[PDB]
Design a protein around this nucleic acid. Sequence first.
RNA 1: GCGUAGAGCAAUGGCGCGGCGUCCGGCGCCGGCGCACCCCCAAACUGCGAAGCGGCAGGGCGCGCGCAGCAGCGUGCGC
RNA 2: CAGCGCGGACAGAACCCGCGCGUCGAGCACAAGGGCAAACGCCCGCCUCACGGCGCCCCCCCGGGUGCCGGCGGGAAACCGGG
RNA 3: AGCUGCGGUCAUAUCCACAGUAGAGCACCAGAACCCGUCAGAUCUCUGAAGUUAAGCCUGUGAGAGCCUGUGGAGUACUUGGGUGGGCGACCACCUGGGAAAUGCAGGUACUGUAGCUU
Lengths: 168, 63, 209, 258, 160
Amino acid sequence: ENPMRQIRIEKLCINCCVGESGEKLNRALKVLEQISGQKPCTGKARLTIRGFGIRRNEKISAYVTVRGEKAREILNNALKVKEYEIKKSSFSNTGGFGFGIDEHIDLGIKYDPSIGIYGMDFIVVLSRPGLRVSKRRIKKSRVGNKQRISKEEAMQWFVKNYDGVLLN
Amino acid sequence: AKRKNHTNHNQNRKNHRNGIKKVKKSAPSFRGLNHKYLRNMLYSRKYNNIGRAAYEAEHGPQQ
Amino acid sequence: GRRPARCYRYCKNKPYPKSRFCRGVPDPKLAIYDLGRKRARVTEFPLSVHLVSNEREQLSAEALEAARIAANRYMIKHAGKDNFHMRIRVHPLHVIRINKMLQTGMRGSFGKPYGRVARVDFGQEILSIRTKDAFKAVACEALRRAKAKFPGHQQIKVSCAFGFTGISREEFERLRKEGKLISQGSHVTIIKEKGSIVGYKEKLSKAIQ
Amino acid sequence: KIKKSYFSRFQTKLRRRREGKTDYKHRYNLIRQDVNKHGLMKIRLVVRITNSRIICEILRAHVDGDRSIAYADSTELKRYGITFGLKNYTAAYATGLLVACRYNNKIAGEGPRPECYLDIGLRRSTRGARVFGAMKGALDGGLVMPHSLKRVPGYVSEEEFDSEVFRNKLFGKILAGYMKEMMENYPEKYKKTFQEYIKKGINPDDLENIYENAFKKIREDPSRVSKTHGDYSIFKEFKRVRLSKEERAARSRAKLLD
Amino acid sequence: MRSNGYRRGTRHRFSQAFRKHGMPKPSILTRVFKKGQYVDVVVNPAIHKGMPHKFFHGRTGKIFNIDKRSIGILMNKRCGPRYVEKMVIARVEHVRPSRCNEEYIKRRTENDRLRREAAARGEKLGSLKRKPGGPRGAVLISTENNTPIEIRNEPYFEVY
RNA sequence: GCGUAGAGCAAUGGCGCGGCGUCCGGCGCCGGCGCACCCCCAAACUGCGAAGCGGCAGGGCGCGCGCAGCAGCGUGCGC
RNA sequence: CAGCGCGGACAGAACCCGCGCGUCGAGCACAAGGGCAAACGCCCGCCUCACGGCGCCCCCCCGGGUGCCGGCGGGAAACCGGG
RNA sequence: AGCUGCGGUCAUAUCCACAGUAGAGCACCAGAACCCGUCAGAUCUCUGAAGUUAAGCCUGUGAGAGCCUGUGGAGUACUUGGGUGGGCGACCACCUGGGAAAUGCAGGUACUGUAGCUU
Ligand SMILES: [Mg+2]
Ligand SMILES: [Mg+2]
Ligand SMILES: [Mg+2]
Ligand SMILES: [Mg+2]
Ligand SMILES: [Mg+2]
Ligand SMILES: [Mg+2]
Ligand SMILES: [Mg+2]
Ligand SMILES: [Mg+2]
Ligand SMILES: [Mg+2]
Ligand SMILES: [Mg+2]
Ligand SMILES: [Mg+2]
Ligand SMILES: [Mg+2]
């Protein structure tokens, strides 16, 4: 069929909400430097929550976005942790899916005890070519329903592209 | 002591005894005009039938 | 301790509801606006009788409760607790004030919230009972026990409408046979040719008959 | 879900804003004239870049709509030898050069000339943007616009503008050097990315002379070549026709029956 | 007793119409204005600068002065037994070119043209007054294909 | 130009019951919540909006020539 | 933007991130009203028009509007700025 | 006839759903040495033309939601003016003019300026 409807990885977003500032965060954004190869972004806490110990505007999390084929090697390494097996409900309504690994050294990273151990959320965004019509500056419009990815078309893509196994 | 605060009673009747007089007609005034426009209009009136180049040929530099 | 209702009879003031500007008004003693078998379907009580105000005045919330109890006790004792559904139409939304004045007199005269009244017009229904046709005379009698609690003149009217829908009994019967009615409990929706046709066929699916 | 009161109370934006085509705050400040001038609506050089071509227009606002004074397209650069890279920086410069020499050859030189103003539209005003290449092309063709050269390459100060480092951007010497080294180090990647360059026969060493020769021919003969394009009512059968009201009713009554 | 700010009591006067909010369209910038032309001040409340007083929001006045962004307008106001001429400065977003003399100008330019042309051919036209609605004309309504219909009072019935 | 009477619950803010539910809780029912219809409404609510009022116009125009430092190809002002 | 929806290790009612929707229900020091969505809100850069001298208007003032000649800031510019 | 640039009207244009579109245009799209801008060449910026009409754009469809127009509601509601009309009042009736709104119902889903391009 048509080559322009083919589903790709549009971007992969990683974040580790370590929950507090200090050296554990500054080591955690060094981990996203190791994985992505990019300089990550720090997340600020939106409110001050007594139960979690966070303050408003406190640097709480570290996040990054990786694209291209560089996002694919981060993904299949992260999918080798989860045996390429993801729950059906973990796929989003809008065509994405996500999972979270518990230690980053399952990605092919040596330990480095001065850094530590962090878990992270891998958020996969899928698209067909033609997403630019919703993201560009001039003549911005909605992408059509045929070109939007459903949850099931993301599920069909996940079993076809990665030899995936759905759950439940 | 406490008495009446306000009324407009008999005011329209008072205001129409000598009528509501119009704005009294006057000579046209330069009050409120644009200053760059008014400056230029007076320059056109100063050199009305004789041009500026002929005027400064007579009276020298007019500024 | 309550003033007589002749002091707050007529709609003298602009309507003055409980709002952010008028707070501290107590709750009305008229608590219930639907009596009898409220859950009864639209096609069970064809007859409709109304107590209609022939006055422009303010019905007290106290009189609205007293006429409620007078009419509800009669429909229970004579028609029975299942054979009617009586709805109180007017709601006591207007707040009346009392000056209550050492004795200040007329200085600072604007009054505190004193009670709640419902403001009715000429021809406005106050109460309405939906019954079977056998209990016409019962329902006419319960409303004349209600209008004793009310100031001024009221009129009991037997309406040709079917129950609490606006549709007349001849016109309601026809559309019920046509399949054009979807019940909403006390009232009804008439099925029209305006939807999408897949939605129209779901509308005939949920019709009454 | 969204309630019905949403749609009934929804006030749509202006159609060219819903289309994402005009910045009406920017458009308001751009075409604004002093009330002292009353009729003299300002001319504006509007530069628009598409995927294929670069549009340059001098046009003036009226009540019914803007009236075009002059037009040039980068597709018109084929007469001047430029058939390659129709949306690059130099095609932007040459198209800006083309309206400026069209508009000056249109009006005769007895009275003073009005100032024109640059209309980027919704493109970003960056240093090295093509929309300012069309600005710089228009000033070289004699169109008087109250510019400053801060966003054209070669700028170091308001008094000092380096024409030489402007010229290697302009004459493709930055492009040809990139085009030349790709041809040596990755000849097959050179074969794929510059396909219409090879089919045109363009060579990167030849590329400066093509642009320099084009700039003379624009300034010598900027005159518009016209195409008549007489009849296109053949294309009328390609459009579809609407149904009638009773035919819409006939499909609806049929849809009820099945 | 109400407070006397510059926009007092303008909750409805300085509002926008339903589904007609927003900044003004750029087409207002293509309107000409001339000295002597009548304009209607109607305030655009989206434009906060150059807003006239609320008193002039219904009023129509003649332009005396034209500025860079604004317009001076002569508007008379009753101060007791006199009309006092106020000079109203308003941005152009708050005015409209008035159609008060719209039909007079249409009448005048045609009639002055017809008087010029008749004077050219040696004729003259006496008076071109607007004739008002006079008496009714005589009518002939034939009962051919139009039979008279009786109107009767009908018995009062009431529906309930 | 207005936003009163009326009208309207469509947004804001209230009032009240039913109806519906691949919603939640409790033990089919009850209670929440959601939706659609509906109900009673508003001096400090308005998708509408009168009667009634307010402003302004019903006279100078057309043409031509001069002038300007304004303007950039007009606008004013003189005749 | 408020808010909603659906996804995501620890992670919970409430940490963060993503995608989708979202007529303004958010925000604009504050009272209320009006206003406002490629903004009048948010963020960032550069700034200090929160300026001098002459006027005029709305007009008791207060406050605001509008010009002219200078001096500037931002911007590629039109423009905008006299808190 | 259409597309496109710039517009005018600012929903008959919005919103949902499903269809179809030869040409050219508009696009999506290929890429990132440079200018430029980012966490990320996603956007912006530059360079390209290998692919593709899948989307956008366009058009059609829908007893679609809304919106628009007509009609109706209705001479109804309300009201200017008048009476030594009525009524204990509340207020009502009459006379003379003016005269609505919501629901309903029917049809409509765009017009247009300028410029360029398309057989
Ligand atoms: Mg007593
Ligand atoms: Mg009173
Ligand atoms: Mg801009
Ligand atoms: Mg201000
Ligand atoms: Mg009101
Ligand atoms: Mg009312
Ligand atoms: Mg708000
Ligand atoms: Mg102030
Ligand atoms: Mg100021
Ligand atoms: Mg419809
Ligand atoms: Mg009398
Ligand atoms: Mg349609």
